[PDB]
Amino acid sequence: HPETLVKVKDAEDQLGARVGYIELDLNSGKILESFRPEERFPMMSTFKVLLCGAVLSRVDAGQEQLGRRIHYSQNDLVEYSPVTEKHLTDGMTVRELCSAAITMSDNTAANLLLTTIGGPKELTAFLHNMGDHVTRLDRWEPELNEAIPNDERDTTMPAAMATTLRKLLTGELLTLASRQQLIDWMEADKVAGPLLRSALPAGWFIADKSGAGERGSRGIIAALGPDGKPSRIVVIYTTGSQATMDERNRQIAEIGASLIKHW
Ligand SMILES: *[B]([O])([O])[C]([C]C1=[C][C]=[C]C(C([O])=O)=[C]1)[N]C([C])=O
């Protein structure tokens, strides 16, 4: 609804930065509303969903086991490793690593998984093969959050990410069981409380993934809908702001409040 676009422009004015937004129909894939849909933005931690998607495809293919255990050490630990840092001694299974990377944004968990699949270049090749010729992963955590203006590394476009997420959640790409596992991880997200989740009415469904990075970068991808089932995909990215994390969270939540009001 165009009233949501008014809020999106207002957020750009408040933040002194670019905001990219897209609302996509889950079922048909039609674009319902967009703002800077084809400009590139840094993906930040929202890539974590794509990563586990690639891991699940390997599991479906017999090349990986969710139950497999990975051991790492103090040397692998990077900033923002709340979960991995507590399991140094016993390691963690693939399943727990994906759960940590998705529900808590754990950086070390993502790096470990990136390694198992062959690194950024392979995650990038997996996306390419599913029809996404725009989104690209080039670095590991946390360097991928640099957000250097005009840099293409580690970026996606709102339309690219929305359509890719739709294919992952509803395409023939993953088996039903894996699709569900993916949705289960996103629905259990524990760090995105002050974003879309704060505008969501009771009884709605939400499965999401946030991210933050340098240069005021912040973003969120989500599948949501009334009555406990998703029916739309929303992607929102911003970068360039000098505003505080709280101000960035607020504008994103005000964008969500508008989207919900005009559902
Ligand atoms: B991700 O954005 O690449 C990662 C870890 C992260 C930090 C702070 C907030 C979130 C989130 O999920 O909202 C994620 N970012 C960095 C800078 O390490």
From Swiss-Prot:
User: Outcome of mutating residue 14 to K, per the record?
Assistant: In TEM-2, TEM-3, TEM-8, TEM-16 and TEM-24
Output one GO MF annotation. Answer: beta-lactamase activity
Active site, renumbered: 45, 143
Q: Which domain of life is it from?
A: Bacteria
Record flagged with keyword Iron: no
Stated EC number for the protein is: 3.5.2.6
Reaction(s) the record says it catalyses: a beta-lactam + H2O = a substituted beta-amino acid
Its keywords, alphabetically, are:
Antibiotic resistance, Disulfide bond, Hydrolase, Plasmid, Signal, Transposable element
Instruction: Cite the effect that the entry attributes to residue 139 to H.
Output: In TEM-6 and TEM-16
Per UniProt, where does substrate bind? 209-211
Reported effect, residue 214 to K: In TEM-5 and TEM-24
- Class of this enzyme: hydrolase
Respond yes or no to whether keyword Signal is given for this record: yes
Biological process according to GO = beta-lactam antibiotic catabolic process; response to antibiotic
Q: Give the matching InterPro entries.
A: Beta-lactam/transpept-like, Beta-lactam_cat, Beta-lactam_class-A, Beta-lactam_class-A_AS
Uses:
This protein is used as a marker in many commonly used cloning vectors, such as pBR322 and the pUC series.
Q: Misc remark for this entry?
A: The beta-lactamase present on pBR322 was cloned from plasmid R1 (R7268). The class A beta-lactamase family has a specific amino-acid numbering system, sometimes called Ambler or ABL numbering and often misspelt as Amber. A multiple sequence alignment was used to derive a consensus sequence and then the consensus was numbered taking into account insertions and deletions. This allows use of identical numbers, e.g. for active site residues, despite differences in protein length. UniProt always uses natural numbering of residues, hence there appear to be differences in numbering between this entry and some papers.
As for family, the record states: Belongs to the class-A beta-lactamase family.
User: What name appears for this protein in its UniProt entry?
Assistant: Beta-lactamase TEM
Gene from which the chain derives: bla
